[PDB]
Design an enzyme around this catalytic site. Structure first.
Site, PDB file in Angstrom:
ATOM      1  CG  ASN A 180      -2.066  -0.968   1.114  1.00  0.00           C
ATOM      2  OD1 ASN A 180      -2.620  -1.410   2.123  1.00  0.00           O
ATOM      3  ND2 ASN A 180      -2.444  -1.300  -0.110  1.00  0.00           N
ATOM      4  CG  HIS A 230      -4.798  -7.426   4.625  1.00  0.00           C
ATOM      5  ND1 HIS A 230      -5.604  -8.034   3.687  1.00  0.00           N
ATOM      6  CD2 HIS A 230      -4.535  -6.186   4.149  1.00  0.00           C
ATOM      7  CE1 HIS A 230      -5.821  -7.197   2.688  1.00  0.00           C
ATOM      8  NE2 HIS A 230      -5.184  -6.069   2.943  1.00  0.00           N
ATOM      9  CE1 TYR A 239      -2.771  -5.609  -0.441  1.00  0.00           C
ATOM     10  CE2 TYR A 239      -3.163  -7.852   0.346  1.00  0.00           C
ATOM     11  CZ  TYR A 239      -3.648  -6.635  -0.108  1.00  0.00           C
ATOM     12  OH  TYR A 239      -5.004  -6.459  -0.272  1.00  0.00           O
ATOM     13  NE  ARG A 293      -8.623  -9.799  -1.571  1.00  0.00           N
ATOM     14  CZ  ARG A 293      -7.808  -8.783  -1.306  1.00  0.00           C
ATOM     15  NH1 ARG A 293      -6.907  -8.880  -0.334  1.00  0.00           N
ATOM     16  NH2 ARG A 293      -7.881  -7.673  -2.037  1.00  0.00           N
TER      17      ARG A 293
HETATM   18  C1  LIG Z   1      -2.338  -7.554  -3.193  1.00  0.00           C
HETATM   19  C2  LIG Z   1      -3.812  -7.431  -3.533  1.00  0.00           C
HETATM   20  O1  LIG Z   1      -4.604  -8.415  -3.537  1.00  0.00           O
HETATM   21  N1  LIG Z   1      -4.191  -6.089  -3.859  1.00  0.00           N
HETATM   22  C3  LIG Z   1      -5.644  -5.842  -4.253  1.00  0.00           C
HETATM   23  C4  LIG Z   1      -5.673  -5.429  -5.737  1.00  0.00           C
HETATM   24  O2  LIG Z   1      -4.999  -6.472  -6.467  1.00  0.00           O
HETATM   25  C5  LIG Z   1      -3.768  -6.205  -7.093  1.00  0.00           C
HETATM   26  O3  LIG Z   1      -4.068  -5.234  -8.236  1.00  0.00           O
HETATM   27  C6  LIG Z   1      -2.864  -4.795  -9.054  1.00  0.00           C
HETATM   28  C7  LIG Z   1      -2.944  -3.433  -9.690  1.00  0.00           C
HETATM   29  O4  LIG Z   1      -1.863  -2.955 -10.199  1.00  0.00           O
HETATM   30  O5  LIG Z   1      -4.126  -2.948  -9.617  1.00  0.00           O
HETATM   31  C8  LIG Z   1      -1.789  -5.630  -9.139  1.00  0.00           C
HETATM   32  C9  LIG Z   1      -1.868  -7.000  -8.433  1.00  0.00           C
HETATM   33  O6  LIG Z   1      -1.448  -8.171  -9.129  1.00  0.00           O
HETATM   34  C10 LIG Z   1      -3.218  -7.431  -7.736  1.00  0.00           C
HETATM   35  O7  LIG Z   1      -2.908  -8.419  -6.694  1.00  0.00           O
HETATM   36  C11 LIG Z   1      -7.144  -5.206  -6.237  1.00  0.00           C
HETATM   37  O8  LIG Z   1      -7.757  -6.450  -6.221  1.00  0.00           O
HETATM   38  C12 LIG Z   1      -7.783  -4.118  -5.378  1.00  0.00           C
HETATM   39  C13 LIG Z   1      -9.230  -3.892  -5.808  1.00  0.00           C
HETATM   40  O9  LIG Z   1      -9.960  -3.013  -4.899  1.00  0.00           O
HETATM   41  O10 LIG Z   1      -7.718  -4.525  -3.908  1.00  0.00           O
HETATM   42  C14 LIG Z   1      -6.314  -4.739  -3.417  1.00  0.00           C
HETATM   43  O11 LIG Z   1      -6.312  -5.109  -2.048  1.00  0.00           O
END
Ligand SMILES: CC(=O)N[C@@H]1[C@@H](O[C@@H]2OC(C(=O)O)=C[C@H](O)[C@H]2O)[C@@H](O)[C@@H](CO)O[C@H]1O
Length: 721
Positions: A180, A230, A239, A293
């Protein structure tokens, strides 16, 4: 105003798209370009008709659903990438330039602006959308004025004014860390550049520097290689991916601003690579036990997710120097070349990343040597990763404890990962596609490999829990031998079992004791649930006699061994039961859809054949005990089980031990402080986990008390007779 800010944005564009590196004669690049051509083509033919339009795209029209904002702006970013790509049919296309400009303005007026409030998921409002807006504006900055760029980024400052926290405009903000925090950089550092705001750039970079600090508690990277996110979830593979992927993109830009990051602060990145990421990569696949997940996303199976990490590692290697650069290049190269299943280019989504990989693979100056054996005890996140280079197999042990959550079900993702940490194991062998090609939606979630459970039904709405016990951990002796245990209690406190594992170089022993059940549900341990290949069928043997499995479960009482024989010995799997055991087996086609485990995924039916091996536990105080021996042919397996005839030292409610006479190694788990005499050679004195090696009249000891997370002086826990 062409200035240092635009210079930085040019560098940014070269990193997130890389049109300057495009070469139509480059096959891999032409493939990515064509993919973008089709996406832009599809978006253009479906975008709405500026005459009383209620939305831009009908399938992403409900703006109450935050994901629709991000998906919408991401379509514009794709357009920006092609309008600036000399070889795209949309290069400098007037209609696409106007479409992006008009779409930005429309969304600004009716959907996303400083006057709006978060509706749906905060992530879309603070990370997903801002990132897409920043990238679109950066790529097409020669088609927008500075005033317009400031106008369309004002909303970003409203939802994300503080570089240290997210959800600032809600009633429950939080401290930004890990992945994040890196996204915070991709939001505010780029917005800062676009807005020519020095304070935003500087303050944001300062906040980012926190990511380089290893932690001994909470979310972040640990000294032992663990990565938690988390609050208490093992998360190196999702993450952590975001963290390394995003940071590697940002660094080249950050280091050229007036607030570069100190070189010694960034040194920990190399620690994450060697300690945290590398062990989780086997034959080009990122171990699912570290992905949370994300395992429930069809477009993100193991090998795909691994590229997220690999591309990040490669960029870091590219910005490094000397032996550090060389060693990292070698790491990336050997991993990619070891992957005969997944085409690495399928997840290199920018021309520079493609260019880098191509040069790496063709540079004879970069050594590519098969990786050596290793065993990582990620005690801070209750996971263990083992890899044997001589035999060519990887082993992953997924646990949890009072310190970690078992599984993550959130955002409607991973609805059935209930038992993925209840002593579940992973075997990485010759079939690199095992946990891919639809494994997750078709695997029977009630029979995860290695787990002891009752057959009670579970609800998809359930969420994770921590373990009542802290007695879960691994004691590592060397790169090939370690012992682990888990004082297991099931989700509804109706079943218990002392589960232990003995990693002995080329095999793993599975011991379970004190199995008790207070419910009226049936209890059993899934020895394995292996996804089969229609091309490489297995010949099944029970007690060395060929067996014919069917969809219907068949019982095999008095079983001494089970052997799964493939035409490729590197796919062979043998199970040796220390004591004749009553098991059951079946081979059946299992159907399901990704939507079943992730609401946002396709409902298209998927199917795979699985071979399931189980052992029922009908009485209190039951137990199981067997040795998993992979990658050896039938004759060798049969020879080995005779060598192991007396390898089981004990398997009761207080002591569990396995001895490897060939290595001279003992694996021991003690649940109490009684004096345990082993093989009439030595005694172990304290509750905890042990891995011991005898070298002559010498003894090498590796003791670990999982509850206190400490070892102890040799004399306190060991005594030679
Ligand atoms: C680590 C994780 O699960 N993050 C969530 C987002 O997923 C990631 O999205 C991207 C990106 O560049 O947008 C790259 C990653 O491969 C992917 O894991 C997405 O699902 C988001 C939606 O609200 O929530 C995050 O927590």
């Amino acid at each position: 105003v062409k200035d240092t800010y635009t210079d930085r944005l040019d560098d940014w564009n070269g990193i997130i798209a890389g049109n300057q590196y495009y070469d139509s004669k480059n096959d891999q690049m032409a493939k990515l370009n064509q993919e973008l051509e089709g996406k832009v083509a599809d978006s253009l033919s479906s975008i709405s008709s500026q005459a009383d339009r209620i939305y831009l795209w009908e399938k992403f029209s409900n703006y109450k659903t935050s994901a629709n904002l991000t998906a919408t702006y991401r379509k514009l970013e794709e357009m920006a990438k092609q309008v600036t790509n000399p070889s795209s049919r949309y290069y400098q296309d007037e209609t696409v330039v106007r479409t992006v400009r008009d779409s930005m303005e429309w969304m600004h007026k009716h959907v996303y602006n400083s006057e709006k409030s978060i509706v749906g998921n905060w992530w879309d409002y603070e990370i997903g959308t801002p990132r897409a807006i920043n990238n679109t504006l950066s790529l097409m900055k020669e088609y927008f004025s500075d005033e317009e760029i400031k106008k369309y980024t004002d909303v970003i400052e409203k939802f994300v004014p503080d570089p240290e926290h997210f959800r600032k405009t809600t009633d429950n903000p939080f401290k930004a860390l890990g992945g994040n925090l890196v996204d915070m950089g991709r939001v505010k550092v780029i917005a800062g550049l676009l807005r020519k705001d020095d304070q935003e750039i500087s303050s944001t970079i300062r906040s980012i520097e926190q990511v380089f600090k290893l932690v001994d508690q909470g979310e972040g990277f640990y000294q032992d290689g663990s990565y938690i996110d988390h609050t208490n979830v093992a998360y190196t593979g999702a993450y952590g991916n975001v963290l390394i992927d995003g940071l590697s993109q940002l660094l080249p830009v950050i280091q050229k601003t007036k607030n570069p990051i100190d070189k010694d602060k960034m040194q920990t990145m190399y620690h994450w690579i060697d300690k945290s990421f590398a062990p989780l990569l086997v034959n080009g696949e990122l171990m699912d036990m570290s992905r949370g997940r994300s395992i429930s996303r069809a477009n993100s199976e193991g090998h795909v997710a691994a590229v997220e990490v690999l591309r990040g590692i490669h960029r870091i290697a590219d910005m490094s120097e000397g032996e550090t650069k060389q060693r990292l290049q070698s790491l990336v190269k050997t991993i990619v070349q070891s992957d005969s299943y997944y085409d690495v280019f399928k997840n290199l989504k920018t021309y520079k990343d493609i260019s880098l990989m191509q040069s790496l693979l063709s540079d004879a100056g970069v050594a590519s040597v098969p990786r050596t054996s290793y065993l990582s005890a990620f005690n801070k996140m209750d996971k263990t990763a083992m890899y044997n280079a001589e035999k060519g197999f990887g082993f992953g042990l997924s646990l949890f404890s009072s310190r970690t959550l078992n599984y993550e079900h959130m955002n409607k993702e991973n609805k059935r990962g209930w038992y993925t940490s209840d002593g579940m194991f992973y075997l990485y062998n010759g079939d690199l596609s095992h946990y891919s090609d639809g494994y997750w939606p078709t695997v029977n979630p009630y029979k995860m490999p290695g787990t002891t459970e009752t057959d009670a039904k579970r609800a998809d709405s359930d969420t994770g829990k921590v373990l009542p016990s802290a007695f879960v951990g691994t004691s590592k002796l060397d790169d090939a031998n370690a012992t682990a245990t888990m004082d297991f209690t099931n989700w509804n406190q109706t079943l218990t079992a002392h589960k232990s594992w003995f990693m002995l170089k080329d095999k793993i022993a599975f011991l379970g004791s004190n199995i008790q059940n207070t419910s009226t549900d049936t209890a059993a341990t899934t020895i394995d649930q292996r996804k089969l290949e229609s091309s490489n069928p297995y010949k099944v043997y029970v007690n060395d006699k060929e067996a014919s499995l069917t969809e219907q479960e068949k019982d095999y009482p008095e079983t001494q061994s089970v052997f799964l024989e493939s035409s490729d010995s590197k796919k062979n799997i043998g199970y040796f039961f220390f004591k004749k055991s009553s098991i059951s087996m079946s081979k059946a086609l299992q159907k399901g859809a990704w939507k079943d485990i992730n609401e946002g995924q396709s409902d298209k039916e998927v199917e795979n054949e699985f071979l399931t091996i189980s052992q029922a536990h009908k009485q209190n105080g039951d137990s199981y005990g067997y040795m998993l021996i992979p990658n050896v042919d039938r004759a060798t397996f049969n020879q080995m089980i005779k060598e192991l005839e007396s390898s089981l030292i004990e398997n009761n409610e207080t002591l569990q031990s396995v001895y490897d006479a060939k290595q001279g190694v003992w694996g021991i788990v003690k649940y109490d402080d009684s004096v345990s005499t082993i093989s009439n050679q030595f005694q172990v004195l304290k509750r905890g986990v042990y891995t011991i090696r005898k070298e002559g009249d010498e003894y090498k000891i590796a003791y670990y008390n999982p509850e206190t997370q400490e070892s102890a002086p040799d004399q306190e826990v060991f005594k030679k007779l």
